Structures are given as structure tokens and as C-alpha cells.
Design an enzyme around this catalytic site. Structure first.
Site, short mmCIF file in Angstrom:
data_model
loop_
_atom_site.label_atom_id
_atom_site.label_comp_id
_atom_site.label_asym_id
_atom_site.label_seq_id
_atom_site.Cartn_x
_atom_site.Cartn_y
_atom_site.Cartn_z
N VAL B 99 0.86 -1.18 0.00
CA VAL B 99 0.00 0.00 0.00
C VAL B 99 0.90 1.23 0.00
O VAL B 99 1.84 1.31 0.79
CB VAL B 99 -0.91 0.02 1.26
CG1 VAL B 99 -1.80 1.26 1.27
CG2 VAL B 99 -1.74 -1.26 1.37
N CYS B 100 0.59 2.18 -0.88
CA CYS B 100 1.24 3.51 -0.85
C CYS B 100 2.75 3.34 -0.93
O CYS B 100 3.23 2.60 -1.81
CB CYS B 100 0.69 4.25 0.36
SG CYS B 100 1.00 6.01 0.35
#
Lengths: 226, 226
Positions: B99-100
Site C-alpha cells: 500500500v502507498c
């Protein structure tokens, strides 16, 4: 500094809380509190261990109070210490908010009497006995009360709160910093859009909980009638 | 039981982790682990205190590994113990996800070489020096690798994982149980949709971090070149 408080209780649905927490904690001049009877560990319904930061007695006057939902809501609806704390804080808070079944706790505290409100779709029938005007919308505002549905309702309404406490440009900046642009791969997040077979499965899985919460709701309503 | 593991590190962006955690923990026959060097408290970038459940040495072989992002990614990109653990687990995992800015950790571990991948918009230029083919899409799949953008990317891709590990009806049931149907009140979650003035503010606020991460990325790339 704006004071924002989340009630953190055993068997909470943690994402109801941790979503808006991370958004609001990104704002300048905000202090965020995780409130329970004393500081220390509190276990969410998934087993995730969180840490309350302050007790009821030590919590400062809040500008925003947020009640998450979860399995643990049933016990809270009959916890006189928690309900009294919620009533005290709601009296002066600029915003009184909840996520999912957290609105049933506001109902047990008497804060939905005569107010438009929503809750989780499987428990929506419990709003009327707590005095609410039930509304089937994802976010329902009535004065300074804001009730939302969905495990991530607090992420979305946190952006609304940011825009009203600060300004729209601040809310937009936080959204961009977090690159927040959801796109679910299925369209089954409402009983009106999910397949009927999926709705049936979800309803039967919730039936025992709904039955127990009917009993709790009636006792909570009797206390409000006194 | 399907074994799912999240890396939990100091200064993590907690929602990157807690979102997919609550979704995946709702599935039957799943065990979810929060992994660090030893069990015990780990503080997220907001100050929220989480608890790791297992050490690197004691973690079982994972079917899914997920690397969240956050401020703390810079230290992780040069943590040889963490990078070695990620490489070991990725070798046999069915899914390797991030994520991210978590994808920058996968990059430092060498797992993006020749692979299509994304990361947070402000740090996207750091993918190519780590060997990746940069892609400007919210979720990018390349074999068993899945990288996503946005603080809640893991909520959305967790529903995809649920459908592939189980079936579509199971993913739909979880979505309905959680009443997950987001509707952000602003449209500023991408640099292509936010106002230019907001993009400027966000870029300047990220500039010092990007500068430091350029330096870290070059050292990490030198290690991959050896």
C-alpha cells in the site's frame, strides 16, 4: 487545539475508529483521544490490540466525539458510566458523530430522540424504539449530529468535518496527501445492490445478534421512558 | 488456514494496515499476523500504538504478505533484517502486496526489478531507480505482485484477494456485512483531479521527505547493483 475523541471499547470494529483517526490526526492543531474507563489495552473484535489514552474522568471537553460500532455495542448500550460520559460530552460538543452501529449507543444515551439518524442496514429496525426518525441514507445530519453507515463512513465524514472546522482547501489537501480515491471491485455494499442470495446469507449470519440486540434495545428504551 | 501477514514498523501509516486487516480478518479460516522484530508495541506515525504479534523468526510461511507505507519507510529501505525477511516470504507467497509507499520497501528488497508497479504520487519518481516499470494506475498487478495507491488501497484489493482465495460470493458477502460503499465528499484524491493550488501545497509539504528519500533510494539501488 481542536479536541477530538473516540470511544474505544472491547469488541469495537476497529476500522470504524482507525479510519477517521488517521484522517483527523493529519490536521494541524488537533489533539485526538482514545477514551475508555482507564488508559491501557483494549481488544477489538478482530483481536487487534489498541491502547486507550485517557479515562472518562480525565478527558478534556471535546469539540468532536465519535462513537464507533462493533460487536461490543450491545454491552455499551447498558453501560451507565459510558452513557453518562457520552451525554456530558455531547452537551457542549460542536459535532456528535457515529459510525455503523455506534448510532445505537447514541440512541441508548437518549441522543437520538426526535432526530433523523441511520445505522447498519441489518440493525436499522432498532432506531425507532430509541426515538429516532430512521433514514436510509449513508450519512444523515440533524443539527450537530452526524450518523454514517459503512465501515469507512468516518473517513468520508472526517473530510466534511475538516472542511467545516478549517476550510475546503484544507480538506482537499488532506485527501490529496492520502491519495484517497476509493474504487471497490464489487458493488455489494448495500442490500439494494448486492445479489439477493448474498443478502440472505448476510441476514442469517446476523440473526442471532439482531435477536439479542432487540432485547437490549427494549431495556434501553425502558430506561429512556423513565 | 490461510496465513496473512502485515509488516508493522515504527512510523507506519496505520490505516494502510488496519483497513485490509479488518477486511481480511472477517474471512473464515484466515490467521492474520502483525510482524516486527519482536512482539510488542509499535507506534504509528499518528501516535496510535499497535501491537506486533510475532517476530520475524517465529512467523509461519505466509500465503499473503502486505507491506504498508508511512514515514517509517525510509528506515525500512535500509534495514537488512527486514528486507531479508520480505525476500524469504515473497519467494513462496501466493500474493506479495503493498500500500502507498510500501512499494518502495519492496523495491529496496529487489522485488520490483522488471516489474510494473505504482506508489504514492509524490514519490513515484523513485520507482525507476529501483528497477521497476512505473505505472500511474491505482492498482497494478504483475504476476503475484499487487501494488496499490491510496491510504485505503488495501481495503479494495483485500476484496479482490477474498474473491480469488475463496470466491466472488464470499467477497460480496464481506462487502455487504461491512456496508462498504465509499462516497468521498471531495474529488481531490489525485494530482490530476485536485486544484492546482492544492497540488502545489501538497508538493511543497512533501519536498523535504522526497529529498531524503532520493538519497536513501540511491543507496538502496547501489546495494541491488552489487
Amino acid at each position: 487545539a481542536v479536541q477530538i475523541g473516540f470511544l474505544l471499547f472491547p469488541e469495537v470494529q476497529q476500522l470504524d475508529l482507525t479510519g477517521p483517526h488517521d484522517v483527523l490526526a493529519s490536521l494541524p492543531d488537533v489533539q485526538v483521544h482514545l477514551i475508555w474507563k482507564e488508559p491501557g489495552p483494549v481488544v477489538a473484535s478482530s483481536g487487534l490490540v489498541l491502547q486507550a489514552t485517557t479515562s472518562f474522568a480525565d478527558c478534556p471537553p471535546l469539540d468532536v466525539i465519535c462513537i464507533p460500532g462493533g460487536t461490543g455495542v450491545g454491552a455499551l448500550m447498558e453501560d451507565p458510566q459510558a452513557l453518562a460520559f457520552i451525554r456530558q460530552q455531547a452537551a457542549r460538543a460542536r459535532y456528535v458523530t457515529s459510525v455503523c452501529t455506534g448510532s445505537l449507543v447514541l440512541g441508548a444515551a437518549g441522543l437520538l430522540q426526535g432526530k433523523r439518524a441511520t445505522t447498519h442496514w441489518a440493525y436499522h429496525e432498532l432506531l425507532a424504539p430509541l426515538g429516532a426518525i430512521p433514514v436510509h441514507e449513508r450519512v444523515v445530519r440533524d443539527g450537530n449530529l452526524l450518523t454514517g453507515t459503512g465501515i469507512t463512513a468516518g473517513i468520508d465524514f472526517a473530510l466534511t468535518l475538516a472542511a467545516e472546522l478549517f476550510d475546503a482547501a484544507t480538506a482537499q489537501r488532506v485527501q490529496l496527501q492520502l491519495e484517497y480515491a476509493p474504487a471497490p471491485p464489487f458493488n455489494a455494499g448495500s442490500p439494494d445492490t448486492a445479489p439477493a442470495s448474498v443478502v440472505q446469507q448476510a441476514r442469517q449470519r446476523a440473526a442471532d445478534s439482531l435477536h439479542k440486540r432487540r432485547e437490549i434495545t427494549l431495556r434501553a428504551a425502558a430506561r429512556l421512558a423513565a
